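User: Last request for today: this protein with calcium ion, please.
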Amino acid sequence: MNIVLMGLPGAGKGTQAERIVAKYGIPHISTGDMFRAAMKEETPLGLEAKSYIDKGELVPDEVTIGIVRERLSKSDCERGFLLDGFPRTVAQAEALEEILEEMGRKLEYVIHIEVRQEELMERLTGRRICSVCGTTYHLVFNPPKTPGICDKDGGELYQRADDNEETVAKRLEVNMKQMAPLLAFYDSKEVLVNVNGQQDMEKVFKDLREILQGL
Ligand SMILES: Nc1ncnc2c1ncn2[C@@H]1O[C@H](COP(=O)(O)OP(=O)(O)OP(=O)(O)OP(=O)(O)OP(=O)(O)OC[C@H]2O[C@@H](n3cnc4c(N)ncnc43)[C@H](O)[C@@H]2O)[C@@H](O)[C@H]1O
Ligand SMILES: [Ca+2]
Ligand SMILES: [Mg+2]
Ligand SMILES: [Zn+2]
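Assistant: Here's the final one, the structure of the complex with calcium ion:
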């Protein structure tokens, strides 16, 4: 189960990754989550990534390819893996193809989760995360019982630094410009599958399960 989840910022990649990883027991490899964890602890990966992440720009290829190479080399990826938000450039895609061909693997599906830009803007600006447990909420789409507070543990919710409207707009632009060529690269291999991300979370997952259960 060698899978990539691709989509504009906000499309639900992390939401579906958690589902796939829970059901199929394959590692969750999210470059965004890896950068963010590094930035929080101020490691040298974090420091180098931070300026790009704050600006809504893509971290440079070599760095990104590096953390993915290191991650794939671990023994938990022998049965499959879920790459969430990588690749994001055609250079990353070609690098990955090379890494996997040496590992005697190929990508089985690249899943493009499609959502209109107005709802993406709303998803990102309204997302809130628990500072205690990391549970994600949304102001309108899945609100806590008490505003600003986690249902599970009473912890105070926070907003990511890049989820403000200005930086969301830049993120959408930056990622949309990369997208057509990346889609084409995978469509030419005929491994690209498009899923309508405007469905509820379980119905999106059900559409993914209809293909992934074959692996
Ligand atoms: N390969 C690469 N190369 C270069 N640089 C890289 C890189 N990868 C990362 N980076 C750098 O790292 C930065 C951070 O990347 P990253 O952290 O990966 O951010 P992103 O791709 O912009 O998207 P998000 O995590 O914000 O969105 P998501 O699609 O995971 O949606 P989520 O499920 O959270 O959902 C969003 C919200 O919507 C809600 N939602 C989800 N599904 C649904 C649904 N079905 N209906 C309604 N609401 C839903 C959720 O509850 C939540 O509130 C990048 O901007 C870049 O600088
Ligand atoms: Ca919807
Ligand atoms: Mg994410
Ligand atoms: Zn919590």
